[PDB]
Amino acid sequence: TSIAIGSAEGFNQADKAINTAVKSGRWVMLKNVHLAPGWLMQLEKKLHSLQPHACFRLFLTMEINPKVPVNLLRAGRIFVFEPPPGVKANMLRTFSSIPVSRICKSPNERARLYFLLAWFHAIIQERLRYAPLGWSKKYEFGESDLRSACDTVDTWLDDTAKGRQNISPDKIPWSALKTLMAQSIYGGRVDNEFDQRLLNTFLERLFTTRSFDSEFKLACKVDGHKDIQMPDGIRREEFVQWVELLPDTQTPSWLGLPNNAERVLLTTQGVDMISKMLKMQ
C-alpha cells in the first residue's frame, strides 16, 4: 500500500494502512514524509510501542532535508539514493533494473540497443558532475528518462522487425530512435541550444549502423592512445560481463570532457575529506 503524505486524508489512510498491515503482514509505503515533520514524530512513537507481524515492512521515501526528526532517523535503517558513482556503476545499475526477459526477446539486435542505451544514459548522467562544462545546468536526467527510452526502443524495434529472429543493422530505425531521444525523452529537459547541440552529437555518434561493427569506439583517447572498444557480444550476458571488466580508471575523457575537468572537483573533495576527518576527532 503506497500513500502520498501531505494531506489530512493522507494521514488517516497512513494510520489505517499501518494498523491493517501490522496484523495482516502486508507492506506499507509512505512517500514524501519529509513534508510532514510533525506527524513523523507521532509515527515514531506509534512504531516503538508495537509488535507487528513477521512479514510487515514499512518504507518511508523522503528527501534529504534537515526537517526530518532525529529520532525517526535513529529508529530506522537509512538508504541513500543518488546517481551512481561512475560509468561502470551506472551501467551495472541500469542492467540490473531492466528485467532479463526484456533484453532477450525476438530480435537478437535488441540486446545491443539496450547496451547503447545504458552507455548513452551513463555518459549523459555522469557529465552532470562537471556541471559548468558537461552541461549548462543540473538537468534531472533520471531513471524516468531511461524507462521512456527503453519503451521507445521496444516499440520501434518491434515495429520494424515483426518477430524476426535477426534484423539487419541498416534496417534498424536509427532515425526514429535518434529523433525521439533528442526531442521527446532526453531533449525535453534540455532548454538550451548548445545543450541540445551537445545531446545531438552524442546520439548521432552512438546510435548509428556503425555501432554494430567490431571496430566501433565508444570513447576515443581516454588516456594516452587507448580507447574504449565496442563489445563483440550479441547476448545480454556478454554485455554485462564487459561492463564488469571495465578498468575502474574512469576519467572525464571517458565522457569526452578534457582530463582536467575533474582536477578542481577532486581537489575540493580531497580537502573536504580532511575537514570531515578533522571534524570527528
Binding site: 562544462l133 578534457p258 582530463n259 582536467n260
Partner: protein, 97 residues
C-alpha cells in the same frame, strides 16, 4: 569618434549585451544599412599589432575555455582557459550562404 577606437572589456561593463547592439547600430548608421541584416565576424589579433577599420571594434578580456586560437583558428588544448589578446568584432552584411 574617439569612443569607437577604445577597446573595452565586456566583463567590465554592466550590460555587455548593450555594447554589441551599440556597435551594431553605429556600423549600420555609418554605412546607411539596416540593423536586421548585419552579421558578426570575429578576428583575434594581438592588442598592439591591430588595426581597426570603420566596422571593427576591439574587445579585451575574453577568455577561451579549453582551446587555443592561433592565426584565427581554434585547436583543442588541455589548458583550463586561454586569454585572447584582442578580439575585433566586425559587422558585415548578411550573405545567407
Amino acid at each position: 569618434k574617439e569612443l569607437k577606437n577604445i577597446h573595452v572589456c565586456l566583463g567590465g561593463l554592466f550590460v555587455p549585451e548593450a555594447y554589441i547592439t551599440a556597435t551594431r547600430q553605429y556600423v549600420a548608421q555609418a554605412n546607411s544599412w539596416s540593423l536586421e541584416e548585419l552579421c558578426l565576424e570575429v578576428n583575434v589579433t594581438t592588442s598592439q599589432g591591430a588595426t581597426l577599420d570603420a566596422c571593427s571594434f576591439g574587445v579585451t578580456g575574453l577568455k577561451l575555455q579549453g582551446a587555443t586560437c592561433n592565426n584565427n583558428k581554434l585547436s583543442l588544448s588541455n589548458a583550463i582557459s586561454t586569454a585572447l589578446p584582442l578580439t575585433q568584432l566586425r559587422w558585415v552584411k548578411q550573405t545567407n550562404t
